[PDB]
Amino acid sequence: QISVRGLAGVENVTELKKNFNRHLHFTLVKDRNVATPRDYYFALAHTVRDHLVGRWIRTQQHYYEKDPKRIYYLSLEFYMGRTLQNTMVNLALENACDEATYQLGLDMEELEEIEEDAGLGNGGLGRLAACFLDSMATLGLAAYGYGIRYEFGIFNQKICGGWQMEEADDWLRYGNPWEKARPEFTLPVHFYGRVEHTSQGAKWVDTQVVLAMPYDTPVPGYRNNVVNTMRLWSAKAPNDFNLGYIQAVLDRNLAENISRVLYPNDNFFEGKELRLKQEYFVVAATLQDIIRRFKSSTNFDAFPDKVAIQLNDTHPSLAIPELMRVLVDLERLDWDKAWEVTVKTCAYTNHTVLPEALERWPVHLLETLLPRHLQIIYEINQRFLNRVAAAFPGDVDRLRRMSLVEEGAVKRINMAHLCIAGSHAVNGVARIHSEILKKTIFKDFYELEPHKFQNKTNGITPRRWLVLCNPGLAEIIAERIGEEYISDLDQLRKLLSYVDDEAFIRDVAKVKQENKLKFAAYLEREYKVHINPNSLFDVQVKRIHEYKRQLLNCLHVITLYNRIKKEPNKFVVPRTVMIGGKAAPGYHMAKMIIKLITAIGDVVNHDPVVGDRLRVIFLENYRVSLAEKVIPAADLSEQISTAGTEASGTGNMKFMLNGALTIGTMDGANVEMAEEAGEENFFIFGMRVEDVDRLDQRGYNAQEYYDRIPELRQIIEQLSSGFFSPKQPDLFKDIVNMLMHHDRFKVFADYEEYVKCQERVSALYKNPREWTRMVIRNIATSGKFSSDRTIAQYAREIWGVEPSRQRLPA
Amino acid sequence: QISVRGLAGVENVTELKKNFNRHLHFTLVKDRNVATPRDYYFALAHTVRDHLVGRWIRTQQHYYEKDPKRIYYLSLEFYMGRTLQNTMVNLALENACDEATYQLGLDMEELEEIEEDAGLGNGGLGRLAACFLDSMATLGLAAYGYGIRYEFGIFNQKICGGWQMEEADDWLRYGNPWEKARPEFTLPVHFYGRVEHTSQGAKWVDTQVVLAMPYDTPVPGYRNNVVNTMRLWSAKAPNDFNLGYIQAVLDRNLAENISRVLYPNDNFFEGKELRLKQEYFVVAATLQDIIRRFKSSTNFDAFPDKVAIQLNDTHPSLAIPELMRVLVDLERLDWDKAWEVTVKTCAYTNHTVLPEALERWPVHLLETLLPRHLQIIYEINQRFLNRVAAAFPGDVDRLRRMSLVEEGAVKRINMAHLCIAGSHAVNGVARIHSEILKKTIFKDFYELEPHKFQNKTNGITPRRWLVLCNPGLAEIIAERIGEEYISDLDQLRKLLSYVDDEAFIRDVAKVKQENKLKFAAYLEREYKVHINPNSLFDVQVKRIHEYKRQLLNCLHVITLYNRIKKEPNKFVVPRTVMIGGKAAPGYHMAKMIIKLITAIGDVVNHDPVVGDRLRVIFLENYRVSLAEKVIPAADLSEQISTAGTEASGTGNMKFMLNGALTIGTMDGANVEMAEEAGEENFFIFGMRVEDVDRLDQRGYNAQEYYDRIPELRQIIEQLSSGFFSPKQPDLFKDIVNMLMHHDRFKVFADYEEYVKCQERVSALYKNPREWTRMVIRNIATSGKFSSDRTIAQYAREIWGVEPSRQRLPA
Ligand SMILES: [N-]=[N+]=NCC(=O)N[C@@H]1O[C@H](CO)[C@@H](O)[C@H](O)[C@H]1O
Ligand SMILES: [N-]=[N+]=NCC(=O)N[C@@H]1O[C@H](CO)[C@@H](O)[C@H](O)[C@H]1O
Ligand SMILES: *Cc1c(COP(=O)(O)O)cnc(C)c1O
Ligand SMILES: *Cc1c(COP(=O)(O)O)cnc(C)c1O
């Protein structure tokens, strides 16, 4: 069909068809008379999987022979989403499979919609790990993703009566064809117990044991025949566990609950014991695997030369004291040598500045669960503070500020301080974020060891976020500059010479229109809701959180509605405002925000005077597969977090690559995006970080804005009087109260600027040709945001390895 | 290698080898350099499994086209044991696979030992269901086995310090290649709730729902290309289950615990709620499947003509009221018509007479868990007793004796009475057992409906219990009468004309010697224990229970030991006494019996004066796979239950078919075995049922025997004084107390006869030629005990279907 989807050769199509029938028969044990679409999906999945296996085995054999430095990416989240199409794309099998299934009388797109998303993540942090795995494989790095195989990933969101309802994400129900259980590599993990100081060294004894069973999933690089591994651990009790008889067998669930479910919090720390167990479980099993592989390649001096451990935030921070425990207690190395090895091996990536998101574990928890690790942490703190004391003599406050141990109500361990002390590199995820780290929260550490602090701006993989979800756009681009950009996104800059090309301008706009029509159809298919494909698609999709300010978006929507009602027969650019995202189960304000959105839609979408000029839809169950559908159809990307709160953001990059213009604050990566495309091609508004600080020093008083802005006052009064909740007049009292008295995110402060800049957006949309030309300038300069660039920087500046675009024999 | 194992054709061996390599690569994702024996086992299992799939699909398609009457065998136990060799035997692939693996440089026997036993049963009852499935497939019946897929089967037994230790049987750890999950056929099962009487009929509402997910396993017939299905249900919570968030997800285990573990009791009733849930779970899911299949073949008048439901004991007895519930509450049939259909559809098999083994569920349990079913049961009882009252006017005691509702401390429901009332056929499992049922426990019911009572003597499958476990014997037999006997065991009667054949006599004895050498080697391999292959192998393997009297065996062993010590230089036939079997976790006396056995061995096996003349070994973890090894190596089979307690026994039949002579009481099937072979060819001893009754009427006084038998007195005094437990002198006080004051099984009463008859056994063993000739007479007359004969009788006399030996196109 289309070029970038590969060749549909005669021999391969014939081969695919026969293997498809083979699997349907021998693997699924069915015939064409009783097979359902799901059976067909699995037959295709197994057929494609077969093509991975040869490459997977020789890739790993290759690494064994050449023995390069290995990269271990530890994360408690891997937001992978579907795997079928991604595998076909990276293996250049899309057109062949499309043809083969066509000839079998099946629609491949229909079958792809059957696969369940692998939702082992909450949002940005988890998706970043997924994009990174793709880029590491595409760049030929010997990398391994290590995490937990949650039985239940992020919950499926249902909207009932305008409220969010959560239901278990039983994603393994029908089986997972992509994973390979490896029970032969099961390892033991220890919990509780006591420390016993003998003659030679300490010993951790009387522990409870939980087995870690690994499951391997292949990670194919883009058409380079490289297939890396993502290994996820599953908790299993030992057979002598708790061994009345029946009850002992039933209580095995206690131990296996460790890998049962993903904590659904985005940028929020919940200090629960079960979570601490998950964190140590991944770290303990992973490190034994690392050391095992290392020994099978005695003198750990070369350990840092053959191993790199990247901590995705502080979730796997226990790797630092666990590595020390193993080297000191088990391998018998002296502390100083063990510490040298640990520091040179570990690197830490920070993903936030919000105080409530930082991990601070109560000492009493670590004391009971990991007694030996708490002793090691105290020792580390002792030696670190001695260093601080020697560098800043007499500065006693610095000592208490930098301590890994925080005093107070309950003593806690600051895991971020632990990570900085035990890593040779610490990085932020966007230029502005990394600078904030050095200027504020980690200022003392930067002054002690400036060389440790770096920046590695985030990115997204152009395979899943362009070729896979937007083939039409990838095609018109390839037609004019070739296919090389798919693994070298900087080449999109060549599109700049087509900004005045009438043909290209028309094609770009046509692809967008087709995407909007397709999405507009999808909305009626699976959700039954009519929308106007000619309107401007204004979308904000991301987790629901006060700092992301979906509330500011709501204020604008209500403003537009009030203006229409004020002058009904005045022309306004038609808009379809789409807002989607999940709220953490226990985050009350976030759940109220969702109710507000649907409540607004209930009024706006049924007002005869508005017509098809304004629609407000809440996108249900936003997840990776839904993102792949709505982002390609968007015109406006909403990235409006309060300056200084969104560390980077990645959804912003996805929209830029897919042809949407961006309205946002100078926050996170938005700053670098505007810098790359030129501020005149971005819709920037609001306070900058410096303005927010000025406001805080002075004291934020929402009342001031309410008194000076009539339109804003009207909105607040509508919310307060029950205009959007007739039956429950005070339903939104909490929202109004927060907005008026304790809004940590200054929604009102950016209201005027936001509405004004939204007017400029509507003005440009009225001129199709100029809107598209600006779009072209955005797509053309989005190259820097490829995760291939990000990973190459990690490789060269942190891991000490060189990326390679060399193909392996297939 | 050997004839009965099929042909090793050139084309097939080549084909097997390539498919083996294909699976090792694509399925297991390994290469010959990192593959372990387990990987090879799985590659072979998948290769053999492939050969089943074509036959499995066309068999089921066949039944759909011809639409014969279908047989549903409901059981909460299916003791299947390994599946690899059995599949090869039934598909005539054994020699080809043997050759193919040989050429690949692998020992197939070594790989077979890697497979885990499917131990979803306790003993005889569970194994019977397994043999029955094999015979039903071999006889071409459209039969389905329905049960529960326990995550943990019968526990693995470890012997520590002479005591039994139980450890979880995590048989699914490495995966099960034989099963096929069928999540698409998942059905809902209801629990708790309340009954609501409306205008038209009652309704069961406010129930808790648990999903039943089926897993299908193929059951191949013997070389007839028929492959039936065994469907096992697995418990799964609904995704909206219990839907803080985390806890709700974790509490899903509550619902899924239903299929977690098999209750480890043999002939013992434990009235636990979890067990009741398992029983209803299987019944509810199975009946919906049956009705669904029936409708897809409106007027249930033909239901009994297209459906037969066989209840394996009372465990699935709720099928009777559940069928009524569905027909009356859901289908809206009138009671009388519904009852007529139910009775004609259901048949019940009783497997015991021990009072403690009969199911009597507390009304308060059924009341809370299955409110609608308890109402239906009361109604059934009401109508049944009205029938009794009309047939036996004025007989008020009969009314209370026959009631399904038992009064007393706590009201209970007698499930056996429920089954008789709601079934058109009730059978015992051995002639003597069936007669006892009519004369004692079910006397009142027999007088009311004599036509319902039948007998169906048990049997074993000659495929697993001869060809599979004893190829050497199957071969020498085939050499002289062909292979037709494998599916027509009555032909073994032709061997009678070889009883005087010197060549045959020599071959029979040679096969036994080889089996003993092989087993003697196995004992040193996996368990490290030296034994003399020239001694008489005296074995008693079966579950540990007081009625089976392993204690009587112990008394004989100690007697032999005391006699040797008395006259050290006197000649005695060397013996290796082997006793094995598991004890239910909560059965204290049974666990003490095991300790006694090992304690005896500790003294006997280390006494210099005894030498290699007497050895006492306790066979650890007796299970199906171990049975296949020890039975072919046995010389003496111990079947010494107190007359009237062993309903049938099946281990007795396995020994007879494999060349061992039998020493036993006239109990269960032993009576028919002696009748078939001739009493002169059996070692029968002890009280008959009539003698036991005489003793009970008079009053059993163990003291009498103790006073009149010096050798017995000496033994009891040795046990009491600590002779077998030096460090713990009163360790066996409970055993002595029971034996002397409350032995329900009269161990002492049969002691003298037993020892005397054991002397006759030793006398015959001294004459190899005559011992073997008697063996030949046993093997030659064991034909009646084939489960093919048993199933043909069930088919013709109960289910109303004709068995077929016709091959299906392959
Ligand atoms: N742990 N924890 N929570 C922190 C977290 O999710 N951070 C997110 O990281 C992603 C990936 O670095 C950023 O793009 C988001 O801006 C940032 O909020
Ligand atoms: N439920 N329950 N327990 C009863 C039971 O296991 N019965 C056994 O059945 C098997 C199979 O009918 C008989 O051979 C045994 O003699 C008998 O004890
Ligand atoms: C890209 C992505 C995110 C991150 O979006 P931001 O706007 O940066 O928070 C979250 N969820 C999903 C499903 C995504 O694909
Ligand atoms: C045949 C068998 C039984 C039944 O033996 P009996 O002596 O009749 O009780 C029990 N367990 C296993 C493993 C068997 O193979």
Say which CATH number the domain at B422 has: 3.40.50.2000
Residue A419 CA to residue A402 CA, distance in Å, equals 12
A310: CA distance to ligand 3 center in Å?
A: 21
Task: Give the closest residue (by CA) to ligand 4 atom 5.
Answer: B651
CB atoms under 10 Å from CB of A275, counted, come to: 18
Q: Find all residues with CB under 8 Å of A249, minimum gap 6, and list them.
A: A242, A243, B152, B168, B260, B261
Q: How far apart are CA A395 and CA B190, in angstroms?
A: 69
Q: SS3 letters for B428-455? A: ECCHHHHHHHHHCCCHHHHHHCHHHEEE
Residues 6+ apart with CB under 8 A from B627: B469, B541, B651, B654
Contact A245 B38 (CB under 8 A): no
Does residue A735 share a domain with residue A668?
yes
Asked if the Cβ–Cβ distance from A243 to B168 is below 8 Å, we say yes
Pair A713, A806 in one domain: no
The structural domain count of chain A equals 2
* Whether B705 and B769 share a structural domain: yes
Alpha-carbon span B410 to B408, nearest angstrom: 5
Chain centre to alpha carbon of residue A191: 30
Q: Which two tokens stand for residue B327?
A: 């027909």
Q: Are B179 and B83 in contact (CB under 8 A)?
A: no
Residue recorded with tokens 């387990």 = B38
B295 assigned ligand-binding residue: yes
Half-sphere exposure of B145 (CA within 13 A, CB side): 33
Instruction: Give the DSSP letter of residue B806.
Output: P
Report residue B93: phi and psi, to 5°: -110, 0
- How would DSSP label each residue in B146-200? EEE--SB-SPEEEEETTEEEEE---TTTT--TT-EE-GGG-EEEEES-EEEE-SS
The reply to whether A773 and A654 lie within a common domain is yes
Question: By the 8 A CB rule, do B689 and B700 touch?
Answer: no
> How far are the Cα atoms of B267, B441, B545, B568 from residue B355, in angstroms, in the given order?
9, 9, 14, 46
A37 touching chain B per CB within 8 A: no
Token couple for A535: 């309107």
- Interval between CA B661 and ligand 2 midpoint (Å): 23
Q: Find where tokens 């997977």 sit.
A: A56
| Inter-chain contacts counted by CB atoms under 8 A, chains A and B | 103
Cα-based torsion angle of the residue sequence A84, A86, A91, A97 in order, rounded to the nearest 10 degrees: 40
Contact B29 A56 (CB under 8 A): yes
A374-380: long-range contacts, CB 8 A cutoff, minimum separation 24: A374/A413, A375/A195, A375/A202, A376/A321, A376/A324, A376/A325, A376/A328, A377/A321, A377/A404, A377/A405, A377/A413, A377/A418, A378/A405, A379/A335, A380/A320, A380/A321, A380/A324, A380/A339, A380/A404, A380/A418, A380/A421, A380/A422
| Phi, psi dihedral angles at B46 (to 5 degrees) | -65, -35
Same domain (yes/no): B387, B494: no
- Closest-CA residue to A17 (of A90, A81, A105): A105
Token duo for residue B54: 């074509």
Q: List the structure tokens of B630.
A: 């020890």
Are residues A219 and A140 part of one domain? yes
Q: Which of B718, B712, B734, B711 is nearest to B595 (CA)?
A: B734
Instruction: Give, as one character, the DSSP assignment of residue B204.
Output: E
Closest residue of A to B158, CA-based?
Answer: A240
Compute the distance between CA of residue A319 and CA of residue B74 in angstroms, rounded to an integer: 52
What is the identity of the amino acid at B152? F
Q: Could you give the CA distance from residue B331 to residue A478 in angstroms, rounded to a whole number?
A: 63
Question: How far A241 CA sits from the closest chain B CA (Å)?
Answer: 8
Query: What tokens appear for A275 in the block?
Result: 């979570």
User: Do the beta carbons of residue B304 and residue B345 sit within 8 Å?
Assistant: yes
The response to whether B292 counts as a known ligand-binding position is: yes
- The answer for residues whose C-beta is within 8 angstroms of residue B577's C-beta and 6 or more apart is B538, B539, B553, B557, B614, B615, B616, B617
Distance CA B668, CA A767 (A): 96
* Resolution value (Å, 1 decimal): 2.0
Same domain, A403 and A481: no
Instruction: List, in order, residues 6 or more apart from B14 with CB less than 8 Å away.
Output: none
Chain A residue with minimum CA distance to B165? A243
Q: How far is the CA of A651 from the centre of ligand 3 (A)?
A: 5
If residue A159 lies in a helix (H) or strand (E), which one and from where to where? strand A156-160
Residue nearest to atom 2 of ligand 1 (CA): A267
A768: helix, strand or coil: helix
CB–CB of B419/B321 below 8 Å?
no
Q: Identify which of B405, B415, B402, B294 has the alpha carbon closest to the alpha carbon of residue B345.
A: B294
Give the position, in ligand 3's atom list, of the atom nearest the Cα of A460: 1
Distance from C-alpha of B642 to C-alpha of B668, rounded to nearest angstrom: 10
Chain B residues in contact with A243 (beta carbon < 8 A): 165-168
> Is the separation of the CB atoms in A514 and A483 below 8 Å?
no
Beta pairing partners, A197: A202
Task: State how far the Cα of B687 lies from the Cα of B667, in Å rounded to an integer.
Answer: 10
Task: Return left, alpha or beta for A678; rule: phi > 0 is left, psi -120 to 50 is alpha, else beta.
Answer: left
Instruction: Mark whether A98 and A21 lie in a shared domain.
Output: yes
Least Cα separation, residue A237 to chain B (angstroms) = 10
CA of B134 to the centre of ligand 4 (A): 17
Please indicate whether residue B289, judged by its CB atom, sits closer than 6 Å to ligand 2: no
CA atoms within 13 A on the CB side of A297: 21
Terminal alpha carbon distance of chain A: 25
Q: What angle do CA A185, A187, A189 make, to 5 degrees?
A: 165
Q: Which domain holds residue B647?
A: 460-786
Taking the C-alpha atoms of residue B186 and residue B259, their distance in angstroms, rounded to an integer, is 14
Q: Max Cα separation, chain A?
A: 90
Task: List, as ranges, residues 729-788 from A with C-beta within 8 Å of B.
Answer: none
In angstroms, the CA A591 to CA B275 distance is 42
Distance in angstroms (rounded) separating the CA atoms of residues B507 and B694: 46
The rounded distance, in Å, linking the Cα atoms of A445 and A425 is 12
A 10 A CB-CB count for A806 gives 9
Q: CA B750 to CA A662: how far, in whole Å?
A: 95
Of A733, A732, A757, A736, the C-alpha closest to A603 is: A732
User: How many CB atoms are located within 10 Å of the residue B298 CB?
Assistant: 7
* CA distance, residue A359 to nearest chain B CA (Å): 19
Cβ B593 vs Cβ B544: under 8 Å: yes
Residue type, B312: N
Residues of B in contact with A41 (CB under 8 A): none
Closest CA to A371 of A202, A188, A148, A187: A202
Same domain flag for A153 and A231 = yes
What phi-psi label fits residue A384: left (phi over 0), alpha (psi between -120 and 50 degrees) or beta?
A: alpha
Q: Which amino acid is at A712?
A: L
Using DSSP, state whether B18 is helix, strand or coil. helix
Nearest CA to ligand 1 atom 15: A649
Q: CA-CA distance, A56 to A62, in Å (whole number)?
A: 10
Determine contact, residues B694/B701, Cβ cutoff 8 Å: no
B489 and B455, same structural domain?
A: no
**For residue B207, which of B219, B220, B187, B192 has the smallest C-alpha distance?**
B192
Nearest CA among A219, A290, A319, A261 for reference residue A77: A261
3-class SS of residue A81: coil
Pair (A515, A419) in one structural domain = no
Q: Count CA atoms within 13 Å of residue A31 on its CB side.
A: 10
Amino acid making up residue B659: G
Task: Indicate the Cα dihedral angle B330, B331, B332, B338, nearest 10°.
Answer: -110
Q: Classify each residue of B39-67 as buried b or exposed e, where b means 16 or more C-beta atoms within 10 Å of its C-beta.
A: bbbbbbbbbbbbbbbebbbbbbebbeeee
Give the number of other CB atoms < 10 A from CB of residue B338.
21
Q: Which of B381, B385, B453, B388 is nearest to B423 (CA)?
A: B453
Half-sphere exposure of B642 (CA within 13 A, CB side): 21
Q: What is the distance between the alpha carbons of residues A234 and A213, in angstroms, rounded to a whole number?
A: 5
Distance CA B356, CA A264 (A): 51
Give the single-character DSSP code of A681: G
Instruction: Please check whether residues B337 and B292 belong to one and the same domain.
Output: yes
CA B311 to chain CA mean position, Å = 15
Which token pair is A598? 């649907």
CA dihedral B358, B363, B368, B372 (to 10 degrees): 90
Residue pointed to by tokens 């819709």: A683
Strand-pairing partners, residue B618, are B579
Burial of B539 (0-12, 13-18, 19+ CB in 10 A): buried
Q: Is B453 left (phi over 0), alpha (psi -120 to 50) or beta?
A: beta
Where do the H-state alpha helices sit in A663-709?
Answer: 670-677, 689-698, 702-708
Residues forming beta bridges with residue A203, ordered by sequence position: A196
Q: Sign of the C-alpha dihedral, residues A464, A470, A475, A476?
A: negative
What is the β-pairing status of strands A70-74 and A143-148? parallel
Separation between Cα atoms, residue B586 and residue A45, nearest integer Å: 48
